[PDB]
Amino acid sequence: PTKRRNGGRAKHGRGHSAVVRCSNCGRSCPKDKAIKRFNVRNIVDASSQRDLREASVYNTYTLPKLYIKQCYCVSCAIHSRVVRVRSVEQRKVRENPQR
Amino acid sequence: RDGEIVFGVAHIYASFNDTFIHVTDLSGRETLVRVTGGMKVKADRDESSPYAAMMAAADVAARCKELGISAVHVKVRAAGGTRKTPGPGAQSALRALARSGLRIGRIEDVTPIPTDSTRRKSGRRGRRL
Amino acid sequence: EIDLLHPDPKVEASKHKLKRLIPNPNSFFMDVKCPGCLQITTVFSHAQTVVLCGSCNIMLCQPTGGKCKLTEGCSFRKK
Amino acid sequence: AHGASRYKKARAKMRWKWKKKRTRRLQRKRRKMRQRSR
Amino acid sequence: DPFLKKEWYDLKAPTLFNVRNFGKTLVTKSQGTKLAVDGLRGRVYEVNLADLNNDEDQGFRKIKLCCEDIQGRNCLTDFHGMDMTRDKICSLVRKCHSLIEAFVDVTTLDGYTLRMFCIAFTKRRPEQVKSTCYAQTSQIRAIRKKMMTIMSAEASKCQLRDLVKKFIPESIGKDIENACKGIFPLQNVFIRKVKMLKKPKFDLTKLMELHG
RNA sequence: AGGUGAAAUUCUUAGAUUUGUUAAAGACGAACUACUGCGAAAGCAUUUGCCAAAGAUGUUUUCAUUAAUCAAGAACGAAAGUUAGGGGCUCGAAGACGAUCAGAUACCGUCGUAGUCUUAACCAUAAACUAUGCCGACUAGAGAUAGGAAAACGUCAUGACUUCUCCUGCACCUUAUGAGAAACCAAAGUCUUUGGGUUCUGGGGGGAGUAUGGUCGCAAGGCUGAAACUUAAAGGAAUU
């Protein structure tokens, strides 16, 4: 039986999508079915960054953020607990948890 | 001398498996001090670790005061390229340069990124563990 | 509750051309007055060609997707 | 034959991709042996 | 024991930048055959613009300087090229906008030639309820051609010394934006990166006019 | 230094790995990239120019049944593979050692030939999938979205945005006294209240996509395709 109406790849009127390699696994999955979290984050945590505010040259300084787009394999995600797993009813929701 | 606070770019290469702390002049052609995680600690496991990268930076802090250098521009770096997520050394090494009292300015990420390029290791099905 | 025989003027104006009860065209003709000449010209609302004047060619309208643009201030009266 | 089901694998089985290959090696051998006796 | 053999030299910027100091480096003590000022020649120096300005602005961007000549513990830099920081250009990239790019290889009246790049992002209006917003390729082509023509005209009219001045106030970026509204509004519109392909001749007397 | 779960093979003071500026080489076009577009399907993401071609929309143009579906027959058909020249960076079936293990011809690691890329032929199959043939009619709404078109003393400067209607796309949500074995389904509805037109395929599970014969192929193999004997269950969807 179909576990998803979608199939999990979210592809319509193509026949062929682009491909990406998983950032951890190595695996070629399709770009559409990859599962992607764009992790913006500053370099030195939060607690440790006050050392740089103390130590530095210049009156104030914006500690510049690190921008990366992670892409995952399904199996790499479910192992690493990005997505885990959901019920048959609650599967269908597509919104943002943590807006 | 007359104008205090002379600078030198610092080049924190921090992959997994090892952390490289490198100090050089603004031109960058001539190096001043070089330290590698694994010069401090001799496990192979603990080459990459928070403590080894911290203890690496303390030797760099000591050598920088002697030669001239009172301040540091800094350039963090994951292996990046084909392999782009800087390791557990880069947290601790950048913190360690503060606790010496080198005067920090101007942080950059300079981990090299393609515009789509090459092929990655581990085949189609990937590095199945 | 419904009237297929006598539909409303408001709703059947909105519908497509052919889907109306009696099909008829929403295009029309125009008596155009260009600024120089006192003459008049019968011009279709949707014109596929660049229409010239009755003598010494000026230009009435340039063709577009649907309705043609008329060149600057020049009036037009529907038939 | 089998057609579409071909590889249904509803229950513990050999695996179709391997099965097709095994039969190909048997078949390929049949050829040279039958051409040898000409 | 190794660093007894070296001595410090002082880099000096153009008069255009407004800060004479910034360049500190060591070339090592001279030895007959392979002397110091040969090895010191043709080094390259990526430096932030907000250092040269001396004000906390333009944190983004970097200017590259190579020292053409050396005279008595001083190094006289005419610039090699321009660059933008990866913090800036990656912050500007957001989802549901149209990234436009462009380039031209352009010749100044001064001998050498450059390869400028531009990045422009379409911007939503006020009171716009549309979820995304995009430029219809054809619109993008018109905008792109417009960007190159404007960029080409500016570089060609002004000599390199003059051109660097245009970059500091980021006047060129503003000009492209106000021309292109007729097609699409745009935002940001930076010049991003510049690359010298030639450097025409050395010319000592021309370089001393820059260093006042 | 490398690399790993942890180590080794491997590379290194005849200066590696890291720092910087170049040069050559051949791949690949990141982020923007989406329950978006285009294409008969396979498939197609850098800039600019040239060459034909296509859909939708608009049309008080034109011909006037020229149409639908298709045994034979014909064109295209990813990846791998083949044949003959180029090119050969990275990755890398085979092979090689180094680990792990009771063993490990595997997973992990380090090298690494064919191949990967391109011109000229072949091959003709993929979970080639929407696992739903192709035209047509009618059934039910709401909000999005891509393309075109019309309207508004609309808002900011020919265009962007707002509000509203029309067809044409990929979809999505909600619901049915419609259907179904159920999963689910605007088609799988309008089918025991059984007939709009038409092409192809199936008849318990093996034996078997095998044998033999035919025909296409340079081969690998493709298309067509049995029987003897064997067996009471195979199989589908949900429940505990």
* F chain positions with any atom within 7 Å of a protein CB: 1-8, 17-22, 26-39, 41-49, 57-60, 89-93, 107-110, 127, 129-131, 144-151, 157-163, 165-167, 169-174, 183-185, 206-212, 220-221, 225-226, 234-238
Domains of chain C in sequence order? 1-79 (2.20.25.100)
Q: Tell me the shortest Cα–Cα distance from B6 to chain A, in angstroms.
A: 11
Distance (Å) of CA E13 to CA B27, C6, C76, E17, E209: 13, 86, 69, 7, 13
- Comparing CB atoms, the residue among B3, B6, B26 nearest residue E45 is B26
Cα separation, B55 vs B93, whole angstroms: 8
**Exposed, middle or buried: residue E137 (CB in 10 Å: 0-12, 13-18, 19+)?**
exposed
Among C40, C5, C43, residue whose Cα is nearest residue C21: C5
Q: Under an 8 A CB cutoff, do B104 and A57 touch?
A: yes
Cα separation, E134 vs E132, whole angstroms: 7
Tell me the two tokens of residue A91.
Answer: 């599967």
Q: Under an 8 A CB cutoff, do A57 and B95 touch?
A: no
Cα separation, A57 vs B106, whole angstroms: 9
Q: Which method was used?
A: cryo-EM
Cα separation, D12 vs E79, whole angstroms: 72
C-beta separation of C46 from C68 below 8 A? yes
> Partners of C62 in the beta sheet?
C69
Q: How many domains does chain A have?
A: 1
C-beta separation of C19 from C7 below 8 A? no
The answer to whether chain C touches chain B by having 3 or more C-beta pairs less than 8 angstroms apart is no
The residues, ordered by sequence, that sit 6+ positions from E85 with a Cβ below 8 Å of its Cβ are A64, B108, E59, E60, E61, E62
CB burial of A2-27 (b: ≥16 within 10 Å; e: otherwise) equals: eeeeeeeeeeeeeeeeeebbbbbbbb
Measured in whole angstroms, the distance separating CA A14 from the mean position of its chain's CA atoms is 24
Tell me which of E3, E26, E58 to substitute to probe the interface with B (most B C-beta atoms closer than 10 Å).
E26
- Residue whose token pair is 């051409």: D35
> Partners of A69 in the beta sheet?
A38
Q: Would strands A36-41 and E194-195 be described as parallel, antiparallel, or unpaired?
A: unpaired
Q: How many domains does chain B have?
A: 1
C-beta separation of A42 from A49 below 8 A? yes
Q: Which residues does chain E have within 8 Å of residue A60's beta carbon, measured at their own beta carbons?
A: 56
Tell me the two tokens of residue B98.
Answer: 């503060």
We report the CATH number of the domain holding residue B69 as 3.30.420.80
Tell me the two tokens of residue B110.
Answer: 């300079």
Nearest-CA residue of chain B relative to E21?
Answer: B3
Tell me which of B25, B63, B76, B108 to substitute to probe the interface with E (most E C-beta atoms closer than 10 Å).
B25
Nucleotide F210, nearest residue via CA and C1': D23
Measured in whole angstroms, the distance separating CA E45 from the mean position of its chain's CA atoms is 12
Q: Under an 8 A CB cutoff, do A63 and B107 touch?
A: yes
The domain spans of chain E are 4-212
The residues, ordered by sequence, that sit 6+ positions from A71 with a Cβ below 8 Å of its Cβ are A20, A21, A22, A23, A29, A31, A34, A35, A36
Tell me the two tokens of residue B14.
Answer: 């921090």
Q: Which helix (H) or strand (E) holds E177?
A: helix E171-180
Smallest CA–C1' separation from B113: which nucleotide?
F30
Q: Under an 8 A CB cutoff, do E25 and B68 touch?
A: no
Domain span at A67? 1-99
The residues, ordered by sequence, that sit 6+ positions from A24 with a Cβ below 8 Å of its Cβ are A72, A73, A76, A80
Q: Which residues does chain B have within 8 Å of residue E45's beta carbon, measured at their own beta carbons?
A: 26-27
Taking only Cα atoms into account, the Rg of chain D, rounded to an integer number of angstroms, comes to 14
Between CA E89 and CA E61, with CA E101 as vertex, the angle to 5 degrees is 30
